[PDB]
Amino acid sequence: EEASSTGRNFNVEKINGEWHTIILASDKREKIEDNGNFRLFLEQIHVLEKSLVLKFHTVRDEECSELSMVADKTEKAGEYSVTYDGFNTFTIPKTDYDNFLMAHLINEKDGETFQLMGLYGREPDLSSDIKERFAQLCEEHGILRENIIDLSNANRC
Ligand code: NA
Ligand code: NA
Ligand code: NA
Ligand code: NA
Ligand code: NA
């Protein structure tokens, strides 16, 4: 089955566990480029009662650095917030739990904003079909394909 974090039949426990950053996308491309703060390689999600604990690494000159953050439930079901390089809110518009997870995030920093979209896989890669479904979801949010970066060959340390 497939679900959205904002949908009535969402089962948050089913996103617990291993994940990998497959593709990232943004209407501010710099954020996810080589040295951007949002070029974040997911490793794990730990589902807690009213939060998610997100385990990431970043890469600078081919060296991995670990970082964790805690995303808290907001007043709206399926939305989470987290402070990281500004104030962030996010939802999971589509996941099948067992293969892929698609996130949509709004960042706000210094009075500005941008959108980030992420495609996460249980394995270090996903099928071209899923990758295409992600590109479609990006289009629905006004993010061009040229702003979509497949990171499936640089998601390892
Ligand atoms: Na810049
Ligand atoms: Na949306
Ligand atoms: Na959204
Ligand atoms: Na592969
Ligand atoms: Na569409």
Residue numbers in the entry: 1 to 157
Any passages from the paper?
Recently, we observed a paradoxical enthalpy-driven thermodynamic binding signature in studies on a model ligand–protein interaction, namely the association of small hydrophobic ligands within the hydrophobic binding pocket of recombinant mouse major urinary protein (rMUP). In the case of rMUP we found that the binding pocket is suboptimally hydrated, a phenomenon that is increasingly being reported in other proteins. However, a negative change in heat capacity on binding (ΔCpb) is nonetheless observed in rMUP–ligand interactions, and is of similar or greater magnitude to that observed in typical ligand–protein interactions. The serendipitous discovery that rMUP binds members of the primary aliphatic alcohol series as surrogate ligands permits a rigorous quantitative assessment of the solvation contribution to ΔCp, since the hydration thermodynamics of these ligands are very well characterized. We conclude that the characteristic negative change in heat capacity observed in rMUP–ligand complexation is largely determined by ligand desolvation, with minor contribution from desolvation of the protein.
We sought to determine whether this excess could be attributed to expulsion of residual ordered solvent water molecules from the protein binding pocket. We, therefore, solved the structure in the presence of an alternative cryoprotectant, paratone-N, which does not bind in the binding pocket of the protein. The structure revealed the presence of four ordered solvent water molecules in the apo structure. By assuming that a given water molecule in contact with each solute occupies an area of about 9 Å2, they concluded that the increase in heat capacity on solvation of hydrophobic groups amounts to about 13 J mol−1 K−1 per water molecule. These data suggest that the contribution to ΔCpb from loss of ordered water molecules from the protein-binding pocket is at most about −50 J mol−1 K−1, since the crystal structures of the rMUP–alcohol complexes also contain between one and three ordered water molecules. There exists the formal possibility that disordered water molecules within the binding pocket might also contribute to the thermodynamic binding signature. However, previous molecular dynamics simulations on uncomplexed rMUP suggested that on average only 3.5 water molecules are present in the binding pocket, which is in good agreement with the X-ray data. In the case of rMUP, the entropic contribution that would normally be expected to arise from protein desolvation is not present. Instead, the favourable enthalpic contribution that arises from solute–solute dispersion interactions, which also indirectly arises from solvation (or desolvation in this case), becomes the dominant term.
